[PDB]
Design a protein around this ligand. Structure first.
Ligand code: BCL
Ligand code: BCL
Ligand code: BCL
Ligand code: BCL
Ligand code: BCL
Ligand code: BPH
Ligand code: BPH
Ligand code: MQ8
Ligand code: UQ8
Ligand code: CRT
Ligand code: FE
Ligand code: SR
Ligand code: SR
Ligand code: SR
Ligand code: SR
Ligand code: SR
Ligand code: SR
Ligand code: SR
Lengths: 40, 60, 258, 280, 318, 60, 60, 40, 40, 60, 60, 40, 40, 40
């Protein structure tokens, strides 16, 4: 898969953080959205 | 157990470049899709005329 | 006021978007169109010594590289190709005039007889064995049940005269089919290739007509640097010769009619 | 100007007519005697479509006169004129423009022919072209003749001719039931399919994934055999596509040739022969 | 006289070809080949083997289910009289849920078979999509087909699912029947004031005509340069020959410009994908955006005026 | 699970990978099919107003 | 141990990369599908006017 | 199908128990379903 | 399938835990959904 | 400004030339789209008679 | 402290001739474009009858 | 991508502040748009 | 690509001032346009 | 590129006044046009 075993630790580290960051952005947007106009 | 513990190894299996770009597309399209879903339902936020209507804002 | 009809509707603007994407598409396609034959040949270029390389609109696209499989090479496009003299002379010194072939028209290698210089290597199977080889090199091949075996038919030119006889059959090892007929020529018993495209069968007579050239011309068929395989260079070379005969092989194909 | 490999083929001779008289090039176009006849037919044709646009159906100052491209339109004479030449400003113009269009397409075809004789290639293209020329002729020559009047021809205008198609189509109520129409439509659709498949293929093999080399004949056959258990092969796919598109043109020509001259009723009614066989 | 390369006049056989080999993961191939002297009369005589994975099996599976609902339903409409089924088959069909139901999932007897056949058909087409992308990857190739199939899928989806959902009514999708679906087409144009004045449908028509024009031209060309092995387009693309030269020149001398062995395949490719893509856009704006295209054309001054020589008084206005 | 014959021998006859793929597929198809049939019948369990009505607890 | 006591062997028979990515696709589509299913029944949550109709709030 | 007589004992063993497990789940779903909403 | 017996036990292990985590998220969604909005 | 810190390594994976041009395109396009969205809604600013009607600057 | 101070290097990555010509065309097109956009709406400046009506070289 | 590890710090830095520059211009224009014409 | 680091600082410079000149001409045009005919 | 540094000075010089000759003919014609036929 043309990576080394260490750059699957590294990449993974970066990935986890970035995705969790996006998810942060999303949960933020939806709580605000719930605030202005709840859908459930 | 709720914990993965060896899931860095997934990139020993799946091309990271491809996985990345794949997610980019899937997210940008899904964004477009659901945006369009909300724009077509009761929860719409553009054609509301809230808090003041612009399409009947003039006498002229 | 609940009726202000807008003059602009989604249909207008979708027709706008379309035309814009269109123009970009057209432009792009014309760029892939200049990966060969360009820049053009004018005496605009020669007069200015070359300071007017002719490319037009749009312009030429950055080269692209084709990586041939099997230690084959690498090709680029667009490329810089070495000029090659024209084996003919201007019918008129005015520009746009056609040229007359030099010498014996079938030999000229000009006109319907012209052809480029393709590699002097062979096209290959997936495996890497000479794709086009004779049935004598390709053991497995076999006529299809119910088809006259060309092997042994008489090859006959455009005027009637016997030309030779089918000494073998060349086949595609990649897409199984008859590509070339082999011809043991009568006048010198030398073996020449005959493209299938130039050959008509007369199954009830076991003849293989050839309108291209005269029986005699079969003597000058361009030759193979090995009787058990053929190169890209040699294929063009073989066919273009026969093709020349379509305008040359007679003192009448030159046209007019009136 | 010429391609970087063109001079070596630009031979003298091969005409049908003209000989050295018009045996020359202009830019990249080949002239030839038929390029001259063609250009003349063409130029007069277009210049007359310009005059028709100039005058309009009721005169240059009336509101129906127009230079708008969607709406300029030159229409045939009424049926009252039959196969006679009708006055210029009453569809005569349309008749002459037609004669010019037929002559131009035929010159064009013959000039492609001289070009095959020069280059020494098969004449598959102008023969194939002749199918479109044929369809055009049934739509202006054959049908309106069989129908005793030239007015049965379609008008030359971008949308007005679409209207011709529409009302002619509707005289038979549900044209879709025209069986030749069904054929021609089938070929036009399938042709569009094979073309997308060949197109896709050539481009999928000569440009494969990075890390891969130009692909092979073996690949080609293996992919479509993988997908649909069959591959017609490289030569033949070029053969099929030619078959589909020429046939599509054919059946368009016949589907319109029978709509009038050989059938007047609605087209769904044609299918009656099937509900009445003595099987049911 | 000269062979036209229409009919292979003398064929040859060789042991069948299982094909270029696939990587691990790409399952075995099934079936073992046969030759048809007659396909052979015009093309590769080899028939199969075929590849069938999870994808391929789930697609053949869904697709045949969908084919059964449509068929069985048609036999039901004639009372299980296979004779009558045979007699009116062309006219038989499975109509869509009625409007009364909107986009609700309807009862078996009122449209539910159509929604199920529509459902299963779509899943099966999109699975065949995935199939061609897999089969195209196993070969290192590119997804050019898949980008086209994806376009035709686009039109399909616009026709039976997207426009319907947008319009809030399953009755707006197309019914499964030959004559029924022809009628659906005509009614569609009628309902929206003549589709001829829909720009997108005009473009789709220019592109359908263009697929016939380009493939006829190119195809005739490749045959005319078949003599020089122009059919062997791959190497004429890597290593230009006199076939690609005579080819580019025929057109150059004819219409003043030309393309290349590689680029014509792009003009053709792009022209086909365009048909379906203008086409789908065309159905997308109907009812969603425009309700009467002729009127639309008048509002944009595109509809021609003719002297009004025949006219009728409006009873609704008396 | 009570003896049968030598009915293991089926795997000398039928490829285990293919039977696996076939069962996965067939079972998936049948699952969706029956779910939709039931959803298309009187026995529907969704558009029932179960257990509390949803189209009149918000359109009002 | 009466249970599949060697059921790892499945990853000796079926390519895991393929199976995994395949599974992801399958779940994303089924998710999409049933989402539309719920959207087509009494259980809908969008064209509902929840919790207050927006197509008739607005001043104006 | 390229098997020896022994991996047709093994594959069959695992196949059989797994299928009976799936069948078990099915029996479960049908009993739950039968309790909550009889169709018979 | 180019794997050793250790890399299908390992794969199976991680697969099983990952799969169970996703499935966990599933029952989570089904409980929120069941509380605010029962379907049975 | 990443915001910290080895997220630069992302240009070790995705060609910077390509990412750049991609974004340029995506934005150059999206702009046109949303512009059109605004042109068909309450936020339209051209065919409004804002702030004074212009086809009623004379008649037509 | 920031970093927009190495923003010339763009001309080491993206061809200047190209960027120039691109911007040039893109602008001419955008111009023609917007002109038509406004010309099809109320802000029009051609069919306004301003400042002296010309079809009013009579009683119009 | 034929870059060294130091020359993707560079691209990243310039890219990020520039990207953020665009985000700014947008936040500005949107506030201007919001002041002159609220959409929510 | 294929400029020295010096001729793209130069190129960037001329590009920048020239582009700004264009923006100038446009703002000129937009201000007159705003004057003869307010649109907002 | 295919000019000397001296003949793009020469070219530019001749070019600008030629261009302005054009701009002149235009502003002149538009002046004529504006006088007989004011538009605003
Ligand atoms: C009633 C509905 C609400 C609504 C509620 C929401 C909610 C709720 C959300 C959004 C979110 C989004 N909305 Mg909204 N939204 C509405 C109205 C709008 C309107 C409008 C015309 O009015 C617009 C334009 C938008 C626009 C958008 C997008 C900005 C965004 C989704 C991004 C995406 O697709 O992922 C694709 C984008 C990315 C993957 C990130 C881009 C990454 C860049 C290219 C990478 C830079 C390089 C990087 C530093 C290093 C490389 C990293 C890797 C490449 C990743 N909304 C209305 C008001 N909107 C979503 C959001 O916030 O984002 C999640 C969200 O959760
Ligand atoms: C009106 C409603 C009826 C109907 C009425 C008709 C009628 C009536 C006709 C068709 C015709 C046809 N219809 Mg219909 N048709 C219906 C619905 C459809 C549908 C559909 C999805 O519903 C489809 C796909 C079609 C498609 C078709 C084809 C089967 C056929 C047109 C091809 C053709 O003429 O080739 C022929 C191609 C040519 C003639 C072009 C020839 C080119 C010439 C030689 C050169 C042109 C040169 C020119 C100068 C080029 C310009 C270049 C400039 C120099 C730059 N119809 C509807 C239901 N249809 C027409 C037909 O049958 O064809 C005769 C016809 O008469
Ligand atoms: C009835 C009179 C109306 C008419 C109404 C319509 C309508 C309505 C439509 C067209 C459509 C089109 N019309 Mg029309 N059309 C008219 C007259 C014409 C004329 C003519 C000469 O007059 C022409 C040339 C055309 C031309 C065409 C084509 C250009 C275009 C569709 C291309 C196509 O094949 O898509 C078809 C290709 C596909 C649908 C994709 C196929 C792929 C699918 C997924 C294959 C799956 C295969 C399946 C799984 C295999 C198993 C089988 C199962 C049993 C199902 N029309 C008149 C004006 N026309 C389209 C359009 O314009 O919309 C704006 C359309 O939908
Ligand atoms: C009408 C009466 C009941 C109904 C009665 C049943 C009955 C009875 C059954 C199901 C079964 C299924 N039902 Mg139910 N079901 C109902 C309402 C629903 C609803 C809903 C939105 O309301 C949903 C989402 C489902 C969903 C499901 C699937 C989770 C499940 C497995 C079949 C399958 O995967 O198919 C396609 C895929 C396959 C068949 C896979 C075959 C492949 C391998 C061998 C098996 C592995 C599958 C996977 C691991 C099993 C997942 C679920 C496990 C049981 C926990 N049901 C209605 C209310 N449902 C079946 C089940 O639970 O499994 C026993 C079953 O026997
Ligand atoms: C909407 C109401 C107003 C309107 C308001 C505006 C506004 C507001 C603007 C214009 C602007 C423009 N208008 Mg106006 N305009 C109207 C009526 C008209 C009419 C008419 C028939 O009535 C016309 C012809 C025009 C014409 C135009 C163009 C002259 C100009 C846009 C430049 C451009 O797009 O090119 C593309 C431009 C470039 C690529 C950059 C310019 C450089 C030139 C093209 C040289 C290119 C460099 C090239 C490499 C050659 C090198 C040169 C030498 C090295 C020196 N307007 C209506 C009445 N108009 C715009 C402008 O800037 O003009 C001042 C502008 O901002
Ligand atoms: C027969 C199968 C398909 C086909 C094949 C085909 N067409 C061909 C060829 C081939 C193989 C050529 O080699 C030849 C060509 O040059 O390739 C583009 C040609 C051709 N395909 C063209 C047209 C064409 N073919 C079409 C279709 C078809 N052609 C089928 C799809 C269509 C349509 C309706 O779909 C058109 C419009 C031409 C570009 C070209 C031939 C060009 C030519 O002959 O030029 C000489 C004539 C002129 C330049 C104009 C003459 C001036 C006239 C007096 C004025 C016009 C009068 C006209 C009757 C008015 C109609 C107005 C319309 C708006 C209604
Ligand atoms: C440029 C747009 C054109 C286009 C493109 C296009 N079409 C395409 C593609 C593309 C790019 C594909 O990739 C795909 C293809 O596979 O190409 C050959 C396809 C496709 N084009 C086809 C149809 C099609 N496309 C059409 C149109 C068009 N498609 C446009 C012209 C048309 C029209 C309108 O005329 C049709 C009819 C299909 C062959 C194929 C999609 C096939 C598919 O999706 O399969 C779905 C399911 C089935 C076929 C069910 C399987 C039924 C089996 C045939 C029976 C075998 C049974 C066997 C004995 C097993 C045992 C059974 C057991 C259960 C007992
Ligand atoms: C007073 C007086 C003297 C008048 C002045 C005369 C005037 C006005 C001068 C202007 C002159 C100019 C500007 C133009 C002359 C106009 C002429 C005569 C008319 C053009 C007619 C013409 C046929 C135009 C048609 C244009 C179009 C789009 C045709 C459709 C065909 C198609 C889609 C085109 C692109 C694709 C092409 C060309 C494919 C051909 C092609 C194919 C098909 C291959 O298969 C192939 C295989 C291997 C190598 C090359 C090729 C190849 O080139
Ligand atoms: C590299 O090249 C490529 C290959 O090679 C490897 C491929 O294999 C492939 C894969 C391609 C395939 C597997 C091809 C599949 C073919 C398809 C989908 C086309 C479908 C066509 C049909 C099902 C046939 C329909 C037609 C019939 C059944 C016969 C009909 C007979 C009729 C109507 C009566 C005959 C008379 C007429 C039609 C009237 C007269 C005819 C004319 C005037 C036309 C003239 C034709 C010629 C050829 C000169 C591709 C894409 C490729 O690009
Ligand atoms: C006796 O016969 C035996 C063998 C049993 C079987 C014979 C069967 C036969 C002969 C069948 C013949 C069938 C024919 C000829 C069918 C013809 C069909 C045609 C010509 C159709 C033409 C157009 C149809 C279209 C465009 C349909 C489009 C429908 C769509 C796109 C439906 C989409 C639906 C979806 C995706 C469903 C979604 C469901 C959701 C999830 C939303 O529900 C909640
Ligand atoms: Fe081809
Ligand atoms: Sr609202
Ligand atoms: Sr407003
Ligand atoms: Sr007038
Ligand atoms: Sr009877
Ligand atoms: Sr609800
Ligand atoms: Sr005005
Ligand atoms: Sr005036």
């Amino acid at each position: 898969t043309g990576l080394t075993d260490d750059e699957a630790k590294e990449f993974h580290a970066i990935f986890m953080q970035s995705m969790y960051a996006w998810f942060g952005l999303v949960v933020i947007a939806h709580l605000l959205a719930w605030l202005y106009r709840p859908w459930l | 157990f709720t914990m993965n513990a060896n899931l860095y190894k997934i990139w020993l299996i799946l091309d990271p470049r491809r996985v990345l770009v794949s997610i980019v597309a899937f997210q940008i399209v899904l964004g477009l899709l659901i945006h369009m879903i909300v724009l077509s339902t009761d929860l719409n936020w553009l054609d509301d005329n809230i808090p003041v209507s612009y399409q009947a804002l003039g006498k002229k | 006021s609940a009726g202000i009809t807008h003059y602009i509707d989604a249909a207008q603007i979708t027709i706008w978007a379309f035309w814009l994407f269109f123009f970009g598409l057209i432009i792009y396609l014309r760029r892939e169109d200049k990966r060969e034959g360009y820049p053009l040949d004018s005496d605009r270029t020669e007069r200015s010594g070359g300071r007017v390389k002719v490319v037009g609109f749009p312009d030429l696209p950055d080269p692209k590289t084709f990586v041939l499989p099997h230690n084959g090479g690498t090709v680029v496009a667009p490329r810089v190709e070495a000029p090659v003299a024209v084996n003919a002379t201007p019918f008129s010194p005015a520009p746009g005039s056609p040229l007359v072939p030099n010498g014996d028209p079938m030999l000229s290698g000009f006109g319907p007889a012209a052809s480029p210089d393709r590699p002097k290597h062979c096209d290959l199977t997936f495996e890497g064995l000479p794709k086009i080889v004779p049935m004598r090199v390709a053991k497995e091949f076999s006529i299809a049940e119910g088809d006259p075996d060309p092997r042994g038919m008489t090859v006959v030119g455009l005027d009637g005269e016997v030309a030779g006889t089918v000494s073998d059959v060349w086949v595609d090892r990649s897409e199984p089919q008859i590509r070339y007929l082999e011809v043991e020529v009568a006048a010198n018993k030398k073996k020449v290739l005959l493209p299938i495209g130039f050959s008509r069968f007369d199954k009830k007579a076991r003849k293989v007509k050839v309108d291209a050239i005269k029986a005699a011309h079969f003597a000058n068929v361009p030759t193979l640097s090995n009787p058990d395989q053929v190169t890209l260079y040699e294929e063009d070379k073989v066919c273009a010769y026969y093709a020349g005969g379509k305008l040359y092989a007679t003192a009448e194909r030159a046209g007019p009619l009136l | 100007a010429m391609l970087s490999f063109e001079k070596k083929y630009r031979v003298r001779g091969g005409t049908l007519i003209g000989g050295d008289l018009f045996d020359f090039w202009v830019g990249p176009f080949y002239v030839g005697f038929f390029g001259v006849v063609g250009f003349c037919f063409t130029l007069l044709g277009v210049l007359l479509i310009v005059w028709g646009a100039t005058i309009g159906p009721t005169g240059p100052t009336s509101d129906l006169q127009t230079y708008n491209l969607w709406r300029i339109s030159i229409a045939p004479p009424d049926l009252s004129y039959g196969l006679r030449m009708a006055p210029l400003t009453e569809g005569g113009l349309w008749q002459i423009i037609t004669i010019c269009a037929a002559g131009a397409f035929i010159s064009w075809a013959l000039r492609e022919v001289e070009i095959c004789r020069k280059l020494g290639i098969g004449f598959h293209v102008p023969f194939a072209f002749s199918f479109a020329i044929g369809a055009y002729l049934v739509l202006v020559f054959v049908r309106p003749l069989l129908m005793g009047a030239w007015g049965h021809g379609f008008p030359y205008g971008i949308l007005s001719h679409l209207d011709w198609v529409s009302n002619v189509g509707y005289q038979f109520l549900h044209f879709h039931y025209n069986p030749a129409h069904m054929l021609a439509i089938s070929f036009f659709f399938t042709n569009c399919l094979a073309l997308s498949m060949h197109g896709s293929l050539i481009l999928s093999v000569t440009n494969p994934q990075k890390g891969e080399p130009v692909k092979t004949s073996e690949h080609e056959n293996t992919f479509f055999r993988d997908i649909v258990g069959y591959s017609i092969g490289a030569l033949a796919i070029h053969r099929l596509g030619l078959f589909l598109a020429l046939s599509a043109a054919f059946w368009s020509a016949v589907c319109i040739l029978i709509s009038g001259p050989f059938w007047t009723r609605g087209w769904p009614e044609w299918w009656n022969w099937w509900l009445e066989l003595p099987l049911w | 006289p000269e062979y036209q390369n229409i009919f292979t006049a003398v064929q040859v056989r060789a042991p069948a070809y299982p094909g270029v080999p696939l990587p691990k993961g790409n399952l075995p191939r099934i079936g073992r080949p046969i030759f048809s002297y007659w396909l052979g009369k015009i093309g590769d005589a080899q028939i199969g083997p075929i590849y069938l994975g999870l994808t391929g099996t789930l697609s053949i599976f869904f697709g045949l289910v969908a084919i059964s609902i449509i068929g069985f339903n048609m036999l039901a409409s004639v009372h299980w009289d296979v004779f009558q089924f045979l007699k009116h088959f062309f006219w038989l069909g499975l109509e869509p849920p009625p409007p009364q139901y909107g986009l609700r999932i309807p009862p078996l007897s009122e449209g539910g078979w159509w929604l199920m056949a529509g459902l299963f058909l779509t899943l099966s087409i999109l699975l065949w999509w995935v199939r061609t992308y897999k089969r195209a990857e196993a070969l290192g190739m590119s997804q050019h087909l898949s980008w086209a199939f994806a376009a035709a899928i686009f039109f399909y989806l616009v026709l039976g699912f997207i426009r319907p959902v947008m319009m809030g009514s399953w009755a707006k999708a197309v019914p499964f029947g030959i004559f029924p679906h022809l009628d659906w087409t005509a009614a569609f144009s009628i309902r929206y004031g003549n589709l001829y004045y829909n720009p997108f449908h005009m473009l789709s028509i220019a592109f359908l005509y263009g697929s016939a024009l380009l493939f006829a031209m190119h195809g005739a060309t490749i045959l005319s340069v078949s003599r020089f092995g122009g059919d062997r387009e791959i190497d004429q693309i890597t290593h230009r020959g006199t076939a690609a030269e005579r080819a580019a020149l025929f057109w150059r001398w004819t219409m003043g410009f030309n393309v290349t062995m590689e680029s014509i395949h792009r003009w053709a490719w792009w022209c086909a994908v365009l048909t379906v893509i203008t086409a789908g856009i065309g159905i997308l704006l109907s009812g969603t955006v425009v309700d009467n295209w002729y009127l639309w054309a008048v509002k944009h001054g595109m509809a021609p005026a003719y002297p009004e020589v025949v006219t009728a008084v409006n009873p609704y206005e008396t």
